[PDB]
Amino acid sequence: QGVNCTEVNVFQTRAGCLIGAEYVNNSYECDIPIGAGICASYQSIIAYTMSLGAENSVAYSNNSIAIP
Amino acid sequence: TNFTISVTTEILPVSMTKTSVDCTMYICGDSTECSNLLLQYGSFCTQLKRALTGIAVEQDKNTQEVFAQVKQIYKTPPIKYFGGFNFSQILPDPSKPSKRSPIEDLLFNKVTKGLTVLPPLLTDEMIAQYTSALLAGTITSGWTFGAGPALQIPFPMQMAYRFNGIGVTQNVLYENQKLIANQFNSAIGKIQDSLSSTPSALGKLQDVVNHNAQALNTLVKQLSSKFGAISSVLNDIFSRLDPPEAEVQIDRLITGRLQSLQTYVTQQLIRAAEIRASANLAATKMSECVLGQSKRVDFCGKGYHLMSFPQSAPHGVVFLHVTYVPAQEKNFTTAPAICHDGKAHFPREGVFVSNGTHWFVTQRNFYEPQIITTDNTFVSGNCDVVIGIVNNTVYDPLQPELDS
Amino acid sequence: KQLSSKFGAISSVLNDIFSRLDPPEAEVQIDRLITGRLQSLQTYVTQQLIRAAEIRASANLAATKMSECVLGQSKRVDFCGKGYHLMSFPQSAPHGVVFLHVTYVPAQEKNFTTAPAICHDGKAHFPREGVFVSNGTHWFVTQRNFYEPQIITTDNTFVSGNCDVVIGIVNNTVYDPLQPELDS
Numbered sequence: 250q251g252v253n254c255t256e257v258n259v260f261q262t263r264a265g266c267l268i269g270a271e272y273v274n275n276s277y278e279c280d281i282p283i284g285a286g287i288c289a290s291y292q293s294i295i296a297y298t299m300s301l302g303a304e305n306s307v308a309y310s311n312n313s314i315a316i317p
Numbered sequence: 318t319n320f321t322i323s324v325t326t327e328i329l330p331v332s333m334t335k336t337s338v339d340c341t342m343y344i345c346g347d348s349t350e351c352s353n354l355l356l357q358y359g360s361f362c363t364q365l366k367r368a369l370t371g372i373a374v375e376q377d378k379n380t381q382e383v384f385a386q387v388k389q390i391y392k393t394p395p396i397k398y399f400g401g402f403n404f405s406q407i408l409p410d411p412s413k414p415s416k417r418s419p420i421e422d423l424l425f426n427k428v429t430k431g432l433t434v435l436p437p438l439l440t441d442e443m444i445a446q447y448t449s450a451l452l453a454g455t456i457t458s459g460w461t462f463g464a465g466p467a468l469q470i471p472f473p474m475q476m477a478y479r480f481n482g483i484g485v486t487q488n489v490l491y492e493n494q495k496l497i498a499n500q501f502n503s504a505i506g507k508i509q510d511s512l513s514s515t516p517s518a519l520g521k522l523q524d525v526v527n528h529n530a531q532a533l534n535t536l537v538k539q540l541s542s543k544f545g546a547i548s549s550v551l552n553d554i555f556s557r558l559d560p561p562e563a564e565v566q567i568d569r570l571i572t573g574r575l576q577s578l579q580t581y582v583t584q585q586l587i588r589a590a591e592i593r594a595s596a597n598l599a600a601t602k603m604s605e606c607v608l609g610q611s612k613r614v615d616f617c618g619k620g621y622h623l624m625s626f627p628q629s630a631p632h633g634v635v636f637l638h639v640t641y642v643p644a645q646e647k648n649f650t651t652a653p654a655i656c657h658d659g660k661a662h663f664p665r666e667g668v669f670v671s672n673g674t675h676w677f678v679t680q681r682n683f684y685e686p687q688i689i690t691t692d693n694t695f696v697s698g699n700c701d702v703v704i705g706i707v708n709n710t711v712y713d714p715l716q717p718e719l720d721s
Numbered sequence: 722k723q724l725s726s727k728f729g730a731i732s733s734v735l736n737d738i739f740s741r742l743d744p745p746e747a748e749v750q751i752d753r754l755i756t757g758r759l760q761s762l763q764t765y766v767t768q769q770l771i772r773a774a775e776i777r778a779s780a781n782l783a784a785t786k787m788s789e790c791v792l793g794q795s796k797r798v799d800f801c802g803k804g805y806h807l808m809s810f811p812q813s814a815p816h817g818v819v820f821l822h823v824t825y826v827p828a829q830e831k832n833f834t835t836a837p838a839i840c841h842d843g844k845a846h847f848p849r850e851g852v853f854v855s856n857g858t859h860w861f862v863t864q865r866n867f868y869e870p871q872i873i874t875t876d877n878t879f880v881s882g883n884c885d886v887v888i889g890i891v892n893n894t895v896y897d898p899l900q901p902e903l904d905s
């Protein structure tokens with residue numbers, strides 16, 4: 250936490266560098282929170298950006314409705 | 318006879334900066350004998366660490382709960398047309414590298430040895446994304462996205478729905494849609510100017526940050542206390558006095574430091590409880606009058622509430638409540654009922670009013686005269702039991718159809 | 722485990738201190754143990770009061786939910802259940818309460834075309850409680866929570882003003898049930 254490991258699987262974050270977990274570009278559901286928007290999970294252990302949710306862009310129109 | 322659109326700001330803190338402290342580092346630091354002597358006191362350090370981790374994860378939990386009220390990230394349509402309404406101030410600016418609206422930029426600019434500050438799990442960028450998604454959901458779906466799947470709806474249709482929910486007919490909307498949009502834009506500009514001109518508008522988060530900084534400064538400065546010893550430093554006492562009294566002096570110093578740390582922990586605990594209560598209030602406001610229409614009076618806005626736009630704030634949340642305020646009242650003569658042909662007529666939803674010589678039915682929030690007929694009134698008994706009735710004829714809508 | 726601490730003394734048992742140390746300094750050692758355990762008890766009491774305040778707030782919220790959406794109907798959105806709340810069933814729990822919420826969730830949306838009003842005979846017709854929808858050829862009125870198309874009728878619509886001031890209106894006729902009644 251707040252300690253750089255360059256003067257002591259390395260991924261440097263805002264909180265600090267993570268040792269033992271590899272960074273993955275793909276984002277999934279968070280299981281173990283860490284901080285600074287990056288959290289790790291077990292699938293081996295990997296680190297990835299937190300996923301807010303599925304993207305859904307509703308088609309807004311001036312004269313359209315979706316009645317249930 | 319008239320109405321105005323007013324916007325108000327309500328600020329509620331949701332979280333503070335997370336703090337992590339090490340007991341053995343804060344009390345003495347790099348002394349091996351102090352570390353050995355601290356092990357016989359029990360599990361005070363473990364209890365303090367557990368309490369700090371618990372309040373930190375509670376802060377993270379309520380910060381996630383107050384913002385991530387939906388699991389779908391909505392995006393604004395590329396066409397920024399909503400029937401003449403303007404929302405450029407609340408919608409994020411694509412030109413900004415942080416994808417933040419100029420309002421959020423103004424709020425961000427207006428806010429300025431063992432202990433350390435842990436960065437929050439929910440930082441600025443996805444909080445801004447969550448606020449943008451909530452704005453898109455409340456501008457394209459109304460309350461339908463907060464109660465299930467998102468349903469597309471025109472903005473004037475949502476305005477008519479909210480007006481009917483608050484008790485206003487849809488006649489006055491389309492007749493003055495341009496006037497309503499102009500009033501809303503003028504109110505938005507005026508409240509933006511007031512927010513930019515008044516430095517005390519965001520005072521709640523300012524005093525929260527000031528209190529946290531003052532508590533940290535007091536905790537730091539309490540280390541320079543003699544606490545009955547010759548000096549606040551421990552190596553001089555260790556290397557100067559004999560160990561039989563040096564042990565007692567170090568014991569007194571470390572127990573004073575432990576008492577100060579316990580006082581700071583208790584203050585942090587009660588401040589976290591207050592912040593949790595404020596975050597619960599903010600979450601109730603979020604659930605009530607953001608993703609839907611709230612029938613409560615003066616709960617999250619003065620006057621007849623219509624909607625609110627949540628805005629991202631540093632260590633807090635700021636709501637832009639838009640309310641309905643009547644204006645330009647006029648004097649009229651009212652009657653409890655109307656006696657016609659020996660029968661009492663009562664309005665279904667209006668009120669019998671008179672301008673001096675003619676009687677009309679009007680809404681309880683706006684003035685709209687109409688002829689008293691059988692569709693908007695019901696008959697229940699005769700017209701002598703009630704006190705204060707007047708005499709007025711009732712026109713039959715269906716009579717001229719068969720009169721010819 | 723706090724009873725096993727020594728607080729800078731030589732033993733964790735007061736009997737050993739009394740039977741092994743001279744009383745002029747044994748009194749001071751016993752006083753130090755007493756004040757250390759008093760500080761520990763004060764910390765425990767403060768933690769208990771903080772936890773009791775938090776649990777009291779939680780129980781006040783639970784009693785508010787009990788009063789609001791168990792004994793009656795609450796119009797609050799997502800207060801005690803996601804979506805349109807209907808009712809909830811309280812169940813006993815050890816040192817707690819469990820709510821069995823029942824909610825109304827719409828599904829299976831369908832695309833349709835709407836108009837703000839209907840201009841008939843130079844007058845604007847507005848729905849009293851429904852909303853005008855179109856499937857492509859004809860216009861129908863239905864509630865905002867379900868798809869129940871119906872013929873446009875003056876019973877469920879009110880006329881107020883003309884259609885020359887509204888924006889985006891369409892042209893359609895309005896069925897009057899009195900006309901076939903007087904036709905025969």
Ligand SMILES: *[C@@H]1O[C@H](CO)[C@@H](O[C@@H]2O[C@H](CO)[C@@H](O)[C@H](O)[C@H]2NC(C)=O)[C@H](O)[C@H]1NC(C)=O
Pocket residue numbers: 318319320321496499500645
């Ligand atoms: C209700 O109030 C609004 C303003 O609060 C009035 O709108 C003004 O109308 C005059 C002339 O009609 C214009 O010169 C002003 O520029 C308008 N102001 C705004 C802010 O648009 C409106 O006329 C009032 N209506 C009634 C019936 O009194």
Ligand SMILES: *[C@@H]1O[C@H](CO)[C@@H](O[C@@H]2O[C@H](CO)[C@@H](O)[C@H](O)[C@H]2NC(C)=O)[C@H](O)[C@H]1NC(C)=O
Pocket residue numbers: 397403404405406
């Ligand atoms: C909505 O409001 C924004 C500003 O609040 C308007 O943007 C202004 O447009 C004028 C003329 O195009 C410029 O002179 C100003 O500099 C703009 N303001 C800013 C802050 O850039 C905008 O025109 C309004 N209308 C719409 C449809 O967006």
Ligand SMILES: *[C@@H]1O[C@H](CO)[C@@H](O[C@@H]2O[C@H](CO)[C@@H](O)[C@H](O)[C@H]2NC(C)=O)[C@H](O)[C@H]1NC(C)=O
Pocket residue numbers: 672673674675
């Ligand atoms: C009260 O309101 C009624 C309704 O507008 C007024 O009746 C109209 O008055 C105007 C002139 O003032 C006439 O041209 C209309 O023919 C009247 N309508 C009907 C149906 O008769 C009435 O004058 C108002 N009274 C006062 C004292 O202001």
Ligand SMILES: *[C@@H]1O[C@H](CO)[C@@H](O[C@@H]2O[C@H](CO)[C@@H](O)[C@H](O)[C@H]2NC(C)=O)[C@H](O)[C@H]1NC(C)=O
Pocket residue numbers: 707708
């Ligand atoms: C409204 O009309 C009723 C019925 O025409 C009036 O009641 C009569 O009032 C007169 C004197 O005002 C009495 O002599 C009758 O006996 C009353 N008849 C009944 C059936 O009560 C009533 O006075 C009228 N109200 C006003 C304000 O003029």
Ligand SMILES: *[C@@H]1O[C@H](CO)[C@@H](O[C@@H]2O[C@H](CO)[C@@H](O)[C@H](O)[C@H]2NC(C)=O)[C@H](O)[C@H]1NC(C)=O
Pocket residue numbers: 856857858859
């Ligand atoms: C829109 O709905 C109307 C009414 O439900 C449909 O009109 C009917 O369509 C069926 C199917 O062929 C015919 O058998 C009926 O005779 C029609 N009724 C009338 C009064 O015309 C219409 O077809 C629907 N349009 C679409 C595109 O689905």
Ligand SMILES: *[C@@H]1O[C@H](CO)[C@@H](O[C@@H]2O[C@H](CO)[C@@H](O)[C@H](O)[C@H]2NC(C)=O)[C@H](O)[C@H]1NC(C)=O
Pocket residue numbers: 890891892
């Ligand atoms: C609905 O019908 C009315 C008349 O039945 C249309 O109004 C006419 O519009 C044309 C061209 O816009 C004008 O030349 C006429 O003078 C208008 N007549 C009247 C009496 O206003 C109206 O345009 C129609 N609307 C739609 C959307 O079709």
Ligand SMILES: *[C@@H]1O[C@H](CO)[C@@H](O)[C@H](O)[C@H]1NC(C)=O
Pocket residue numbers: 253254255261262263265266
């Ligand atoms: C650690 O130091 C290296 C170089 O000394 C630097 O590139 C890196 O950004 C530092 N880590 C952090 C988190 O700043």
Ligand SMILES: *[C@@H]1O[C@H](CO)[C@@H](O)[C@H](O)[C@H]1NC(C)=O
Pocket residue numbers: 310311312396398888889
């Ligand atoms: C929707 O219709 C209105 C007028 O009815 C028009 O001003 C607006 O540009 C239209 N929007 C789109 C996206 O076509």
Ligand SMILES: *[C@@H]1O[C@H](CO)[C@@H](O)[C@H](O)[C@H]1NC(C)=O
Pocket residue numbers: 646647648
């Ligand atoms: C209505 O009349 C009362 C007294 O007759 C007066 O005090 C009041 O100001 C009037 N209301 C308006 C809007 O003028």
Ligand SMILES: *[C@@H]1O[C@H](CO)[C@@H](O)[C@H](O)[C@H]1NC(C)=O
Pocket residue numbers: 704705
């Ligand atoms: C209103 O009160 C006054 C005095 O109390 C009384 O003379 C008058 O008749 C009352 N009017 C009505 C409509 O009750």
Ligand SMILES: *[C@@H]1O[C@H](CO)[C@@H](O)[C@H](O)[C@H]1NC(C)=O
Pocket residue numbers: 308315830831832
């Ligand atoms: C309605 O149409 C839009 C685009 O025309 C589409 O994205 C959407 O999926 C449609 N909704 C349904 C329920 O088919």
